[PDB]
Symmetry: C4
Subunit: 469 residues, 4 copies
């Protein structure tokens, strides 16, 4: 990277210590920017969803893959569930989205409960596969709670055949009382749903698909047990990418696991982490890892940094690791708690081929968690970090309660967090457009048409903390 | 600029990182300081009002031009409205101000609504052009709301002929129950209003006027459409200064627009922006720009800096750009959210020929926005940034709703802000005197009689952030 | 001064940026430290009270001079009042303090009002000069408000002759129900009051007196009018020290005033200010000033620094000015808003011969202001900065209201502040002991028996702002 | 120590300015780390409890010595009490803990009062030395307050013989309704209590014992009076370690006291303090001190730093002192208000052989203070700093009230603090496991099997304060 003259700080830098200096630009608008990645992951946007049980679900996988991103499933999920989710996701359409199907005999409470797990704002009543009507919020609200769907269902809705142009769909929905555009198969049965905003996004984003034209998906594995067997089983289950993640990625056990997985030669790229040092990056790459995650205790007040004085500011660590990987011909991923689009922009500018997003996406409809209401009725969802205590207890296999409690004594608390959900941008795409708009604005400011040029022609500067007063 | 020995920070500086060291002074008082500008803008004070729809109105133009400043009209205004406003402003008096004229049959609510858009605190009732009386607050307040002006108008007021000395006017108003000094033409008809504070200010400030003795005015243009045609039309409409502003001023489209406007050779100075780099400043100047605006994402927590890691601390950017412009024989303007007179003082000390003020002036009577009352009855006015979403939608010309929504998807929210209005200093001049007093005190402390000397003989220093605890 | 190896900061330092490293010490206890000053002011402690109308009163003068300090009267006081106060103070005793004298016919409200202007907590009823009894708080409280002193006066009190040893007085008051020790002249009439804490302090502090054994006192003058005439009149009035103070002390008018006063050769030391530069210090000393005040806009968020970017961190300015004065054989005084004893300690360590204390002493019983009660009944006193607006209006002499308002337009607000009074340490001595204890502890830590050694053998260090998180 | 390239700050560093960079690691788990100390103190963990009257009790001594730490008794305790406490502690078991013994005739209020001074949550009723039953909270709660133990005692409890394996004890208590495991001597009488968590900890920690297999204990002495006589008497009383502590440890009186104690040659290591300078450390070591305490006014807002500008950031002072001691072949201890395990980790990394913990342990059951309930029923305990005012008054021996008050005038307030007690981790071991887990995680991250390697192969870095926004 390039810094302004005289800017040679005597400390590692974080995202608050740096800024991008505008340069000569030839890009007209944001839409003239290509966000495709070159790390081999096949993502059309530099966004990866973290393998967190409260985040990495199936609806996230569908939506993110439809919008060009990728999702990594949690490592603790059973192989059968993994295969089921992979089959479900690869069976989804690239243009229309799977809506919520409700029986006419279902209750109002269950109706709204299944309604609030999608961002469409409506649910389709299905009888033998044919839509009869739509149920929305404020339609099941304010009514007697013992009523059923048939007593509140609205039979009037817009209908279109498969293959209809999204522009035509939006034009039809220009005056529609309800923005929903339920999609019907040529036989007549339900074949997905579409939305005017979704129709617009269909012309902006490009879904990430494999050689078969099906949405890509990634899975995570540990370093305990037969790593090779689990990796091969996941690959046979349909997984496209393999992730090996742990708190400390420079330990020899990570090297052994990477060598074991690389020996099988599954023919898929490997993501390994986490390390924050160039030496660790070199060791991981030489061990057989094509992608290296970066970021350990990135915050100055994070749980890891408070518990132990171990960590590193995200920016400098990412810069060094990316430099090492490019020297060795690899790629790096930027983990470490992304909270603003500025974080993504700086990660891209530092040399990271992709960015990893965790708890931020927890407060969304598509998240596996259920939506709850707080003291002030404001929606929120609980978060449990990397995994819950019950989850880690399940990974400890069949062990004596004495040994289990002995191991859990040193273990910290669940540290559950109440991630509020923004009403204006509650949808997952309502965050993806936000982040991508930030990144595209950055690219226009720099004057780069794609991410490699963004890394090539970026000039950075440093500011003190007195500007934060 | 000159810094104390040993002060060579390893980071860019902002306004909180620097201070001015007092030096040998020969200036007796604040009044012995000349604030005239040398950038060619013709302003007698280093204040420029930003081209914001919620700020750049007509009353601001009149008051600011009467006090020596300049105002730039928004670029989205129709040409007819621009010409009308230019004619109205150039038809105003250089000593007296245009009051609010109320019909005797008007209602109390409308009376106070038209009363609260000026700082005089009174409105003149007009019948065939002759004053009959004055209506003030607490005069229409506490009365029956269906009453009319004639039922509350006070026919007793002070009257003077045109040409009366301001000192005489103040002496007459020494014992006046109402400080208003409504001004009558020699025929007898209304010819403006005067105020004791305004009379005092008439001897302090110098209105900015053109070769014809009429108040100067500036206009802004974009880089979309026929830039040359719009610039020439605005010049023919009576505009004195042309401003070309955009988020990123170093892009080639800015260069093309500047070249196109300079080819016509309208004979007026050009203001171009925004850039924060010396290279961008050189490119803009060589392209045909006489004045360069500075400041992109100046705040460490501003919307631009949060969305993208793009920006620069205001002080260092201004210093570098001013150095480049002086090397090339140009001038720079200091944009970037001025909030305290310290900001203006440091901008002047850094080498900026003028300072640009935006949202701060929103909370004023003279602002185009209407005054509102909050939950605690405290007055406030809404702000919409550079422009409102409806405004930008209007600039997108005639486009399909599909394309309009597609372009607006990436667009952020309106981000309206409630700018409170200070009761003690609610008037625009009540902020101009504040800022000018700060600047004059700075000049006295340094020991400079005018801005060029202020830039020449200023010595600065650097402080850490621990002083902010 | 001496700094640790490698500590060469690239910025000016303030009190939060430095610390004192302990060294080899031979001092046994705090009492083994001599706090006498060598600047020629004659103060036995390095404390000077600022010339603020809300602070520099007569009770402060008496108490502070009895405790070894000095007080400078405000420059706006009439010469007759100055002479009266000087005569009153020089007529006071060096061991006992003047109590509050109340007539037996006075009302309860007036009784407590005159009671709460002294820290003794009691008032002596006087009839023809002989005490009859004492009235205290909770004695006039809870009673009918129309009652009088004679109905609540307590005739039982301790009495001693003049010349009694303070140790004997304390021993007698060991079991006294009321700690007051009203003092009687050999004739029988009242000759002062004494307190057990005051008796203890009599053996610790040394009152500052002139060649005649009377308490010393200082006065302040401006630079407007006949400076020499006012200075000579004040000297004839009995003033011991002369202070010439203004916002900017490096202006030529200060030089002319200093030369004019020095020409008369009144035979008293001169205090001049304020400057923060070595050049200004040299100019003031060569002009005929023996003591130079330091400190202009010392706070990073003070009114002066917000209004203008003019100022300097207190520590570095004091260091440089003290170095210059010692090079020229002079002395410096440390002004600039002392708030903690750490401030005094660092001022002494930097090389300052004395320290100037302002608003901190406002919240005290001895302050000229009257004690008020807030919303939460917590006592407080108002402060008006250097002087009130009415005061500065009075200094503008006989001028036309037009000119007066013209000059006051640029003048800022009164900026009155509510200085809370600490119930535990409400007395002035309750702050002097605090500050002196801090200074003595510093001296013991360094290992110096007096202030010159404290300046000679002090080693300092620098810390970052991250320790303030 | 080793710092990253280019990190040469121009200021002293504190714990917030530094971080540990992860390195190559071979340690498998936390349990593979040896925490034994090499300073000669005999502690198996790097934890020392401060000699504070509100902290250094007898229950702390027992628990901490059982868990491998050491405790220093306050210097003001009478010699008889010291000998009694030493005998009591050395008479305790190394595996089981002494429970609370309650008479059956005691009242409910007294029952719970004696119950809440231990972390077991139960009390054993004793008749002639044989248990009859257990009384717990919520068992004496909600009952009539005049009832007695016999009316609420639960006679059903688990019983085991002495010598039973802790693993067997836990296995038996796997299904026990009450986790208490009251321990019976082979005769049948009470011989201690055990807990499942305590049983687990018995296999993790190693109690610190002397050559006789009895728990070690330390005592503190002053520099007033016959230091040698008191030191010899304490050594004869059974004390294992001697501590000489004062506010300023570089004074000559400390040197004389150290020489006097070393002349007797009691054959025990000497702890001396406090100093923060290398010169002071060298002087103390040459005077006959084997261990040097570090830390004077470590906080930027502590009472010492506010009273006097004397102090030093803890990290840099510890680094320098440890370097000096290692150069001279000694050891250092890290005092200065430890509040988080990060503090301990950085102290160990800097080169400190041990860490000293003060007020943090005040909010614990084992603390000598009694548990109180606040306004919100939340438990808390008062703290009085190093010692209470009554305590220091008692150390002033037999002195006249006049002299006592004279000395106490300069003395500051008691500064009592309400240390809240965490319900989840209210036990002392519930903090020891926390701290040790943090330290072990640090060791694993660095890749060191013991503290000397932790100091040897640690690499540190520096961060700015802008990360704290």
């Amino acid at each position: 990277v390039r810094f302004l003259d005289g800017h040679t700080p005597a400390y590692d830098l974080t995202y608050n210590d740096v800024f991008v200096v505008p340069g000569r630009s030839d890009v007209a608008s944001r839409f003239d920017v290509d966000l495709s990645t070159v790390d081999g992951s096949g993502t059309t946007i530099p966004v990866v969803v973290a393998n967190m049980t409260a985040v990495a679900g199936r609806r996230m996988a569908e939506t993110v893959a439809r919008r060009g991103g990728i999702v990594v499933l949690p490592q603790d999920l059973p192989i059968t569930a993994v295969s089921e989710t992979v089959d479900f996701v690869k069976s989804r359409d690239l243009v229309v989205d799977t809506p919520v199907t409700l029986s006419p005999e279902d209750s109002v409470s269950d109706a709204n409960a299944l309604l609030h797990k999608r961002a469409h704002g409506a649910a389709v009543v299905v009888f033998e596969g044919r839509p009869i009507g739509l149920v929305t919020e404020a339609n099941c609200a304010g009514v007697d709670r013992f009523a059923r769907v048939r007593d509140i269902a609205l039979s009037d809705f817009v209908t279109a055949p498969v293959g209809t142009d999204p522009r035509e769909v939006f034009d039809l929905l220009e005056h529609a009382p309800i923005d929903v555009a339920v999609m019907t198969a040529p036989d007549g049965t339900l074949a997905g749903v579409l939305t005017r905003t979704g129709a617009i996004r269909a012309g902006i984003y490009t879904p990430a698909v494999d050689a078969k034209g099906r949405l890509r998906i990634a899975a995570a594995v540990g370093i305990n047990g037969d790593v090779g067997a689990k990796a091969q089983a996941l690959a046979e289950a349909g997984a496209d990418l393999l992730v090996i993640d742990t708190a400390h990625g420079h330990q020899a056990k990570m090297l052994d696991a990477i060598k074991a997985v690389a020996s099988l030669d599954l023919g898929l790229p490997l993501v390994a982490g986490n390390v924050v040092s160039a030496e660790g990056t070199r060791d991981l790459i030489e061990a057989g890892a094509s992608i290296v995650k970066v970021g350990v205790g990135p915050g100055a007040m994070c749980t890891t940094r408070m518990m132990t004085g171990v960590g590193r500011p995200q920016f400098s660590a990412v810069v060094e690791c990316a430099a090492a990987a490019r020297q060795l011909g690899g790629h790096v991923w930027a983990d470490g708690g992304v909270r603003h689009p500025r974080d993504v922009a700086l990660a891209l500018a530092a040399g990271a081929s992709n960015v990893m997003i965790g708890s931020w996406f927890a407060g969304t409809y598509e998240s596996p968690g259920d939506l709850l209401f707080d003291r002030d009725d404001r929606p929120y969802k609980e978060s449990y970090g990397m995994a819950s205590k019950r989850a880690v207890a399940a990974r400890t296999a069949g062990d004596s309660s004495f040994d289990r409690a002995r191991k859990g004594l040193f273990e910290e608390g669940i540290s559950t967090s109440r991630m509020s959900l923004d009403p204006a941008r509650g949808g997952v795409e309502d965050l993806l457009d936000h982040i991508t708009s930030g990144v595209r604005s950055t690219c226009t400011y720099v004057g780069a048409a794609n991410l490699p040029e963004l890394h090539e022609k970026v000039v950075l500067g440093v500011q003190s903390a007195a500007g934060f007063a």
